[PDB]
Design a protein around this ligand. Sequence first.
Ligand code: HEM
Ligand SMILES: [C-]#N
Length: 145
Amino acid sequence: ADFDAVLKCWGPVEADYTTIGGLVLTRLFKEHPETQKLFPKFAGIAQADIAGNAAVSAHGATVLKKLGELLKAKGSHAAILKPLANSHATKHKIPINNFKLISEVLVKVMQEKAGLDAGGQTALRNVMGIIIADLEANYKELGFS
Ligand code: HEM
Ligand SMILES: [C-]#N
């Protein structure tokens, strides 16, 4: 049910993955500035210059398309999520807690841009908790606790 509640509001996201992707990453780097250092291509860009950055928005679109592709899997997602855990633990070297940060930014952006109501915001938090727990279990399989 929580996947359905999110998907019932995904239309505005999927309609403009680049604009919404840029909003998410711009907000993440504003509200959680330590996360920006984890993107060496973007680290050190002054905040004022992030909202207009086409590379930032294109990367945000990649992230949101992947999360769409996870959402629409409704928890049957191993072939999608194992590779993401592998790359994020071993290539990008992202500590797990940062996933909670981007998830909360997404809840805010969807509240403001996608019609996600207070129950919907619960639902997305729950779904992101599923995804993050799976990422974390795969991190541990790789030796990253
Ligand atoms: C569920 C949330 C997230 C999703 C769906 C996601 C998805 C992706 C995807 C699809 C890629 C491209 C393939 C790859 O390199 O693995 C990627 C790259 C990357 N992700 Fe994530 N990601 C998430 C969260 C994060 C967080 C929380 C951070 C850091 C705070 C992060 C940092 C990176 C970095 C640094 C890259 C490589 C950028 C580049 O060099 O082009 N990701 N992510
Ligand atoms: C990943 N951003």
